[PDB]
Amino acid sequence: SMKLTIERAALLKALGHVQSVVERRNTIPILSNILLSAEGDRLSFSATDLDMEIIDEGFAQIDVPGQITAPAHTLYEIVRKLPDGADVSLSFDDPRLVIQAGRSRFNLPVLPAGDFPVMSSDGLSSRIAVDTNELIRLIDKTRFAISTEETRYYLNGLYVHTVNEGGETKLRAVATDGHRLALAEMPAPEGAVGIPGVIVPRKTIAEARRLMESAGETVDLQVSPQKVRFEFGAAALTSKVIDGAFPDYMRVIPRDNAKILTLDNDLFAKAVDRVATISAEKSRSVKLAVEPGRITLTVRNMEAGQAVEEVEVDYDGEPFEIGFNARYLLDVCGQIAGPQAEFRFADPASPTLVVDPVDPGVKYVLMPLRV
Amino acid sequence: SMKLTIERAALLKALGHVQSVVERRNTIPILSNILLSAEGDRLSFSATDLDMEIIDEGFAQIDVPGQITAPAHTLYEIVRKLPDGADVSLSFSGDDPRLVIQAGRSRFNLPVLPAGDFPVMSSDGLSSRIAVDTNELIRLIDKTRFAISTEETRYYLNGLYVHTVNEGGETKLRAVATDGHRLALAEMPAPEGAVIPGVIVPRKTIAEARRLMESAGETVDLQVSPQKVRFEFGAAALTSKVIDGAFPDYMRVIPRDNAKILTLDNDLFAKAVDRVATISASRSVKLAVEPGRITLTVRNMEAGQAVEEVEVDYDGEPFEIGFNARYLLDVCGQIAGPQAEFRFADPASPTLVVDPVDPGVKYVLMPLRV
């Protein structure tokens, strides 16, 4: 038996945190459930998709301790729709979970707690406190470049690791999908120096980042070669990592591109977006005809449509033509923090570096395509 | 057209009005296009899906008059992204076979199709213009829209029946929607000129008319024939076929003599219905009605149950009746004041819902087995 009462707001806060992990499509019914575990003065909540597990805790008045599983999204929506201030009773005498508040009564089917997946966290490092805003930045500056593919390939997560440069150790995140790269870094907090490099799955980053919005001043990170764990206070997210070595991305990031050009980032981005409008295609390529003082942008669609726009830029080198996917270019322009962007080109077939003058702790790479 | 300049704001306004009718996909390429016709001091814009046509016009400096067609959504999107205040040149000549759109440092070339292959929407036999208050016309639509069937056939249920009735010596302009499972009626006093054959206005036409009412003025002009309806919103106009067919004698489905009368707090009732309906994913709800109370029950196939008691104003015989939960919530969503009044006969008979604060609306709900 389990039997308790909990304030709607506390119940809603916890269910809200954990239910995000549950895939709407699930042909294994137990993976649609939350594990509820009541003991002492706390109701604990766990949900999983097998690759990761979110846990949270709320205060509750516990008459009889116990554990049961119940449908996650349905439980969340019931509680959401209960009146403000409602005190919520959870109990069992059918074999269903009884949720009772004011004049509403719900009976949900349950599944036994013993069939609920167990996520082991053996051999994690000690907790590493990382400033929340700094961590949010590592993710927001890079996340867009992680592939959206449905595999467990190394490109489908964010490579988190430390490196030694500029007379200190940095905590770095690198994302690449084979078409583009993003890199962001920060001075390594105490305890992060020399963590093993881990590839954190895309969905895990998305969930961590969501939980970061409601976190405090810091989030604790723990890492092992098999597992990564984020603690946000009462909530925690534990995840598998992608197995295998991440590519030697330091060879992909060009160091010696000598054709340097600076431009007004907002004007350029608007010009790119404008010329790209000619095409409705999923991928749209834009030609950059670069010459002293100017970039001429051209997009063509699959039905003889054409758009051209000239943008003045700061450049004095040899003229050349280079092509990029317009979405990848706009993604980079979207991350630039100030009004200028700096591009470093070599030849039309080589990777292009984009640097942000107001932030030396990011690097973006664009891969050219045929123009 | 052949050669003109037009302010971005004037171009965008007109393109935004007309492009909504164009389907995202068209097997006939010219149906994706806007007809541009330049003459005098006006650029005219036309777009169509063959069932209806939207037209509009804007001021322009016309150097060379003429007519051409070009991709609607693309032209709209290009203009949307041009900088504020941009003067926009449109030209078509023997140089390039494409429409040339030029503003500032931007130049676009769009493929065209000839104006002579663009569909023609005839407007022969329309009544003279009837001026209808915009908010009132909006109300007629918003009070009833939800009950139109969402099916793509040319059956009377897939449109809004707009007609004029002599109701006890007073002429009303009335709108009726039903999908065979529920009905909605709204009416207003008939404007001068309305007492017009009854027409079934297609669902999409109502949607487009309603969108255009968002940026209309004080009145909108209505014209009707047995084949066509036309809405005029100043420089913009929407002309549409009607659904050919006899709208049901809906008076036969609206119950007049339902004697079990109950009134409740609409807002609290709707919240209770929404709560119990949560446990499921066309969900029925059971209403166990007795003096002073409705007990709401929803069950699902997965063993899930939700029950809630709501206090109501009723002292008649007890009974149980079932409704589709969404249909019931749709009605409660239209009720204008704090109460709703239900009138029931027996559990297998249609139920009337009236708003005690607006006698110009009627709703009917068909029961389901409980």
Angle between helical axes of A326-335 and A265-276 (0-180°, round to 10): 150
Using CA atoms of A317, A323, A325, A328 in order, give the dihedral in degrees to the nearest 10.
Answer: -20
Query: Do A96 and B271 lie within an 8 Å CB cutoff?
Result: no
User: Could you tell me if B236 and B212 are in contact, meaning their C-beta atoms sit under 8 angstroms apart?
Assistant: yes
Provide, as residue numbers in chain B, all residues whose Cβ is less than 8 Å from the Cβ of A280.
73-74
At residue A340, the 3 state secondary structure works out as strand
Compute the nearest-CA separation of A35 from chain B (Å).
18
Compute the nearest-CA separation of B176 from chain A (Å).
33
Chain A residues with CB-CB distance to B under 8 A? 71, 74, 77-78, 81-83, 96, 103-109, 270-271, 273-275, 277-278, 280, 303-311
Compute the nearest-CA separation of B48 from chain A (Å).
20
Side chain identity, residue A205: I
Residue A123 has φ and ψ, to the nearest 5°, of 80, 25
User: Could you tell me if A19 and A76 are in contact, meaning their C-beta atoms sit under 8 angstroms apart?
Assistant: yes
DSSP character string of A289-312: EEETTEEEEEEE-TTS-EEEEEEE
**Between A106, A278, A303, which is nearest B279 by CB?**
A106
Compute the nearest-CA separation of B310 from chain A (Å).
8
Residue A17: C-alpha distances to residues A72, A73, A183, A210, B26 (Å): 11, 12, 29, 9, 44
Q: Based on the number of CB atoms within 10 Å of its own CB, is B249 exposed (0-12), middle (13-18) or buried (19 or more)?
A: exposed
Contacts of B369 (CB under 8 A, 6+ apart): B284, B322
Kindly give the pairing relationship between strand B3-7 and strand B87-91: antiparallel
Please state, as a whole number, how many other Cβ atoms lie within 10 Å of the Cβ of residue A111.
17
Please state, as a whole number, how many other Cβ atoms lie within 10 Å of the Cβ of residue B48.
24
H helix intervals, chain B: 8-19, 72-81, 134-142, 203-213, 266-277, 325-334
Q: How many CB pairs under 8 A join A and B?
A: 92
DSSP character string of A45-99: EEEE-SSEEEEEEEE-EEEE-EEEEEEHHHHHHHHHHSPTT-EEEEE---SSEEE
Q: Which pair of tokens denotes residue A291?
A: 């010459």
3 state SS for B97-135: CCEEEEECCEEEEECCECHHHCCCCCCCCCCCCEEEEHH
Which has the closest alpha carbon to A365: A340, A339, A337, A335? A335
Q: In whole angstroms, what is the distance from residue A120 CA to residue A134 CA?
A: 28
Which has the closest alpha carbon to A26: A117, A162, A124? A117
Which has the closest alpha carbon to A26: A49, A59, A43, A51? A49
Closest residue, chain A, to B268 (C-alpha): A83
**Between B98, B272, B304, which is nearest A107 by CB?**
B304
Q: In whole angstroms, what is the distance from residue B271 CA to residue B329 CA?
A: 9
Kindly give the pairing relationship between strand A168-176 and strand A157-165: antiparallel
Q: Which pair of tokens denotes residue A13?
A: 């806060």
At residue A260, the 3 state secondary structure works out as strand
Rg (CA), chain B: 25
Contacts of B169 (CB under 8 A, 6+ apart): none
Residue A275: C-alpha distances to residues A191, A341, B78 (Å): 48, 19, 8
Q: In whole angstroms, what is the distance from residue B129 CA to residue B221 CA?
A: 6
Query: Which residue(s) pair with A69 in the sheet?
Result: A35, A111
Contacts of A326 (CB under 8 A, 6+ apart): A272, A273, A275, A276, A284, A285, A286, A299
Closest residue, chain B, to A72 (C-alpha): B279
User: Could you tell me if A241 and A157 are in contact, meaning their C-beta atoms sit under 8 angstroms apart?
Assistant: yes
Side chain identity, residue B69: T
Q: In whole angstroms, what is the distance from residue B64 CA to residue B62 CA?
A: 6
Query: Do A280 and B74 lie within an 8 Å CB cutoff?
Result: yes
Q: In whole angstroms, what is the distance from residue B185 CA to residue B197 CA?
A: 18
User: Could you tell me if B360 and B187 are in contact, meaning their C-beta atoms sit under 8 angstroms apart?
Assistant: yes
At residue A281, the 3 state secondary structure works out as coil
Closest residue, chain B, to A280 (C-alpha): B74
Residue B348: C-alpha distances to residues A139, A318, B177, B264 (Å): 59, 84, 21, 22
Q: Which long-range contacts (CB under 8 A, 24 or more apart) does B186-190 make?
A: B186/B139, B186/B140, B186/B143, B186/B144, B186/B360, B186/B361, B187/B140, B187/B360, B187/B361, B188/B136, B188/B139, B188/B140, B188/B360, B190/B164
Which has the closest alpha carbon to A34: A62, A208, A49? A49
Residue B344: C-alpha distances to residues B176, B236, B319, B324 (Å): 21, 45, 10, 16
Q: Which pair of tokens denotes residue A79?
A: 């509680």
**Strands annotated E in B179-317:** 182-189, 199-202, 219-224, 228-233, 236-241, 260-265, 284-290, 293-299, 305-311
Provide, as residue numbers in chain B, all residues whose Cβ is less than 8 Å from the Cβ of A270.
81, 83
Which has the closest alpha carbon to A225: A147, A139, A121? A121
Provide, as residue numbers in chain B, all residues whose Cβ is less than 8 Å from the Cβ of A263.
none
Residue whose entry in the numeric block shows the structure tokens 């996917």? A325
Which has the closest alpha carbon to B367: B331, B332, B322? B322
Query: Do A307 and B73 lie within an 8 Å CB cutoff?
Result: no
Q: In whole angstroms, what is the distance from residue B94 CA to residue A222 CA?
A: 69
Contacts of B168 (CB under 8 A, 6+ apart): none
Compute the nearest-CA separation of B107 from chain A (Å).
5
Q: Which pair of tokens denotes residue B255?
A: 């119950």
Side chain identity, residue B61: Q
Q: Which domain holds residue A35?
A: 1-115
**Between A83, A277, A308, which is nearest B81 by CB?**
A277
Compute the nearest-CA separation of B299 from chain A (Å).
10
User: Could you tell me if A31 and A50 are in contact, meaning their C-beta atoms sit under 8 angstroms apart?
Assistant: yes
Query: Do B105 and A311 lie within an 8 Å CB cutoff?
Result: yes
**Between B105, B110, B308, which is nearest A103 by CB?**
B308
Provide, as residue numbers in chain A, all residues whose Cβ is less than 8 Å from the Cβ of B305.
96, 106-107
At residue A110, the 3 state secondary structure works out as coil
CATH code of A20's domain? 3.10.150.10
Q: Which long-range contacts (CB under 8 A, 24 or more apart) does A133-137 make?
A: A134/A186, A135/A212, A135/A219, A135/A221, A136/A209, A136/A212, A137/A184, A137/A186
Which has the closest alpha carbon to A279: A253, A259, A305, A256? A305
Query: Do B308 and A82 lie within an 8 Å CB cutoff?
Result: no
Provide the 8-state DSSP code for A41.
Answer: T
Phi-psi region of B168 (alpha: psi -120 to 50; beta: other; left: phi over 0): left
Compute the nearest-CA separation of A295 from chain B (Å).
12
Q: In whole angstroms, what is the distance from residue B36 CA to residue B79 CA?
A: 15
Query: Do A81 and B106 lie within an 8 Å CB cutoff?
Result: no
Closest residue, chain A, to B280 (C-alpha): A74
As for chain A, the residues directly before each break of C–N over 2.5 Å are 92
**Between A82, A271, A303, which is nearest B111 by CB?**
A303
Residue B19 has φ and ψ, to the nearest 5°, of -70, -25
At residue A318, the 3 state secondary structure works out as coil
Q: In whole angstroms, what is the distance from residue B146 CA to residue B135 CA?
A: 18
Interface with chain A: mutation pick from B15, B25, B110, highest number of A CBs within 10 Å? B110
User: Could you tell me if B365 and B326 are in contact, meaning their C-beta atoms sit under 8 angstroms apart?
Assistant: no
Provide the 8-state DSSP code for B190.
Answer: P
**Between B305, B309, B310, which is nearest A107 by CB?**
B305
Residue A337 has φ and ψ, to the nearest 5°, of -90, -20
Rg (CA), chain A: 25
Q: In whole angstroms, what is the distance from residue B308 CA to residue B273 CA?
A: 8
Using CA atoms of A193, A198, A201, A204 in order, give the dihedral in degrees to the nearest 10.
Answer: -30
User: Could you tell me if A299 and A284 are in contact, meaning their C-beta atoms sit under 8 angstroms apart?
Assistant: yes
Residue B79 has φ and ψ, to the nearest 5°, of -65, -40
Contacts of B139 (CB under 8 A, 6+ apart): B186, B188
Provide the 8-state DSSP code for A40.
Answer: T
Provide, as residue numbers in chain A, all residues whose Cβ is less than 8 Å from the Cβ of B271.
81, 83
**Between B78, B304, B309, which is nearest A103 by CB?**
B309
Compute the nearest-CA separation of A47 from chain B (Å).
19
3 state SS for B138-173: HHHHHCCHHHCCCCCCCCHHHEEEEEEEEECCEEEE
Q: Which long-range contacts (CB under 8 A, 24 or more apart) does A217-221 make?
A: A217/A131, A217/A132, A218/A129, A218/A130, A218/A131, A218/A132, A219/A129, A219/A130, A219/A132, A219/A135, A220/A127, A220/A128, A220/A129, A220/A130, A221/A127, A221/A128, A221/A130, A221/A135, A221/A192
**Strands annotated E in A118-195:** 128-131, 157-165, 168-176, 180-187
User: Could you tell me if B339 and B262 are in contact, meaning their C-beta atoms sit under 8 angstroms apart?
Assistant: no
Contacts of B256 (CB under 8 A, 6+ apart): none
Compute the nearest-CA separation of A284 from chain B (Å).
14
H helix intervals, chain A: 8-19, 72-81, 132-140, 202-212, 249-252, 265-276, 326-335
